[PDB]
Amino acid sequence: AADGSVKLWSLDSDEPVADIEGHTVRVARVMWHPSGRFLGTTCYDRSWRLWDLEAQEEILHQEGHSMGVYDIAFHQDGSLAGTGGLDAFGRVWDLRTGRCIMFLEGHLKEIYGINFSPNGYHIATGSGDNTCKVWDLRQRRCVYTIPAHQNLVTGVKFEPIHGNFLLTGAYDNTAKIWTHPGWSPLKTLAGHEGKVMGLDISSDGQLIATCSYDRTFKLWMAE
Amino acid sequence: VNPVVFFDVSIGGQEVGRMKIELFADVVPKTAENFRQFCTGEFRKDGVPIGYKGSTFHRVIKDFMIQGGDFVNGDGTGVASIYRGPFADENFKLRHSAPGLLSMANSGPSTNGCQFFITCSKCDWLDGKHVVFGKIIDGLLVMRKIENVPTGPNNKPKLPVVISQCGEM
Amino acid sequence: EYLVSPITGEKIPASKMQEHMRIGLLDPRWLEQ
Amino acid sequence: DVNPKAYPLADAHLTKKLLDLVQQSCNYKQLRKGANEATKTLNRGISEFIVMAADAEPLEIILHLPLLCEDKNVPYVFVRSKQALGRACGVSRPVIACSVTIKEGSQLKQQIQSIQQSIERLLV
Amino acid sequence: SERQAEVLAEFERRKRARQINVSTDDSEVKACLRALGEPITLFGEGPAERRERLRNILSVV
Amino acid sequence: LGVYLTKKEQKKLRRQTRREAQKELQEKVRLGLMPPPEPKVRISNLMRVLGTEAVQDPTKVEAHVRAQMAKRQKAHEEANAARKLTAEQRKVKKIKKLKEDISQGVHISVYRVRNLSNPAKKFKIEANAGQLYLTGVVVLHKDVNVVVVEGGPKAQKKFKRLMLHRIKNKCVLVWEGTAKDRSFGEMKFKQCPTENMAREHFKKHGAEHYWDLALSESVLESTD
DSSP letter at F36? Predict the structure, then answer.
């Protein structure tokens, strides 16, 4: 929530099982590790915290950004994690060494949507400057820039199986399915009465649910 | 810090200078508050800054004392303070064994008013009867010239020695 | 905070702004009256 | 910072344009002052955006304005000072909530859209 | 005549006084008066009288 | 930031300043610095102030009154012209040269026109780009006019209304965002009959996505 507390809830109880405290700023993002033990929390306190299930302690309070950390994106293997700050900077830290590797500089506004590719080499960072920079971890440079919409891109997430397509959702009431490599807006997800705040793809790739600012959920089913 | 006051002495129409008398608010907070209220004043009687401004010294005994500051009667019988009448003494820890000390002149116990007396010498008999409101940090020459003024019957000065201006420094 | 004065051309604290405008244009003929 | 409740709080660069546009709308008889009049404009569907301060004493007396703005689909933004908002409203007394109202044929329309776009960018 | 000179001097002193910026904070006025040596209060003067006295002092000084 | 004094406060300030100036004049006249003011006489006022002397020498009185009227007009006219001198320098160089403060971010708008065969519209677009100091380029191809304009926010807001409402086959802004620095030079024209020649020219400044977006929009328009 925006109060700084993390609530671990179960699939049966309506009450949160674990109350992870230790943050006073607004907790922006909270994403579990692909292993399942670690959980990275990024808040507006210009740092990012790491927790655990069997420990429930501060593992790594890694600072470094000039502004608050808006979104965090770990790799598919769990070796690296790309944290995005609110000062148009993105640092790819190592989960096994504890040092910065890649600096994702080039954006203008704050980065809101960042997600690593499941192939293990690409990283797509969406900022509020109506652009989306897809860089390569092997080439160590910005491969492409994707002007997906005209508003602040708040959602960037490819397919979790292979990442053949990337869904970019901004505050311009539309989402574009620019292929993660192809970068082609194959289809524009219209019909949203408000700003598209969040979106996610299914594990199989047949349904795409995108939250909006009109308090409704819109699915994308094939016909 | 202790509050510091200032009063310009005008004897016979001639200004003899200003006398800086700092009141000891640690040993006498009530006397220092009364001197600060009588120095400038905001509203004392129907919205009028009544105080020691424009008053005169009614008694001048050479090398003994310079008593005055009576704004009610002008002869030393006036009694006025910020506590709506006479107040008790603050403490007996201050002594008049040094010249320049300004004490609250009174006619007895718990009768200290607006009348103040500058001691021109060391008075051992005045210790315990009156509390010292403060000490003159500057302007001792004007106090020595006002104590050496000619005095008529009952130590009344023949020349008008009044305070032209008074305030806080 | 600090604000520029629209009446004096000087920088003043933000907390004193209301009183600064209230008494920065106290008409001197009020004092005369 | 001072008030975590100030989610819609604008920065120094934006608050200058907010206050300048509020003053301009006041010059055009296009501004309503106070939380009650902002609520009335939101109910009437005449306000195109709502500004408020982040230093109200309870802060809950203008906290229904974000909910009513979401209900009526009207942008809202917070500023860090009630006194400056009141001065921009042309009122000596502090104002903690001001409304800018729709007018037919107004010449402030383009600035209204620009400020609404910036306000929407601030949110989320 | 020196009378004309002193009248003109007083007039230009007042004219400069009309254009001197003086802080409206009573604490800062008292601090400035303490720095420049003149007493804080004179014959039961009010805060506005204190401001006028500070303005006059800054004009002469 | 700055503060805005209210209308009553403005009235008080103006009244105090006027009274200060009036008292200045009155004390100048009191001490003999300035001559005492003469009565202000107009034509309708001539028989009230100069009535007794306008029967003896009527035309001399008329000439004196009209000279006073002209001198009052001479001062006002000179004053307005004197202040007007400020614009003489503060005009096309200080009252029309703003540039919208484009230093930290350049708003870029990419429009894709279907039919741009008219040279008058291209000349008007070049004049609007040169007058508003907005950089950019225009690439022509078979039913594709990709016009990229990077400039200030006010120039972009003017060009969005000029191209969509003041100029007429349809024009649609394909990408409206900001960038770090500038990529294109001055406003020039370039015709490319092949898509590869336009894509190689757009990739020289790092803006190859604008041609790929314009090709994809045309493919999506021709598919449906």
Answer: P
C-beta of residue B20 within 8 angstroms of C-beta of residue B138: yes
**What's the token pair of residue F117?**
């065969």
Give the active site residues of B. 59, 64, 67, 106, 117, 126, 130
Residue A91 tokens read as: 């640092």
| Cβ burial, residue F210 (10 Å; 0-12/13-18/19+) | buried
**Amino acid at position E47, single letter:** P
Q: SS3 helix, strand, coil % of chain F, rounded to 5?
A: 50, 15, 35
Which of E40, E58, E60 lies closest to E50, judged by CA? Answer: E40
Instruction: Provide the experimental method for this PDB entry.
Output: cryo-EM
Which of C6, A214, E38 has its CA nearest to residue F10?
Answer: C6
Q: Which of A148, A202, A150 is nearest to A177 (CA)?
A: A148
- Find out whether A108 and A152 touch, Cβ atoms under 8 Å: no
Domains of chain D in start order, with CATH, are 1-124 (3.30.1330.30)
CA distance B168 to C17: 28
* C-beta separation of D32 from D38 below 8 A: yes
Which whole-number Å values give the CA distances from F20 to B94, E51, F15, in the listed order?
55, 18, 9
Order of strands, sheet of A39-43, starting from the edge strand that comes earlier in the sequence: A27-32, A39-43, A47-51, A62-63
Q: Which two tokens stand for residue A135?
A: 């860089």
Residue B45's CB is within 10 A of a number of other CB atoms, namely: 9
At B157, which CATH number?
A: 2.40.100.10
For residues A92 and A104, the answer to whether their CB atoms sit within 8 Å is yes
Nearest to F3 among D12, D87, D114 (CB): D87
Counting the structural domains of chain B, the total is: 1
Instruction: Determine which helix (DSSP H) or strand (DSSP E) holds F198, and give its type and residue range.
Output: helix F195-202
Q: By CA distance, what is A105's nearest residue in F?
A: F180
Q: In Å, what resolution does this model reach?
A: 4.3
Strand pairing partners for A115?
A124
Sign of CA dihedral F22, F24, F28, F31: positive
Minimal CA separation from C33 to chain F, in Å: 16
Residues B50 and B33: their CA atoms lie apart, in Å, by 14
From the CB of residue F63, how many other CB atoms can be counted at a distance below 10 Å?
Answer: 11
Q: In terms of CA atoms, which chain E residue is nearest residue F17?
A: E18
CA-nearest of B38, C26, B23 to E44 is: B38
Of C9, C10, C31, the CB nearest to E48: C31
Copy the structure tokens of residue F41.
């006489």
Q: Range of B168's domain?
A: 1-169
Q: What is the per-residue DSSP string for chain C?
A: -EEE-TTTSSEEEGGGHHHHHHHSS--HHHHH-
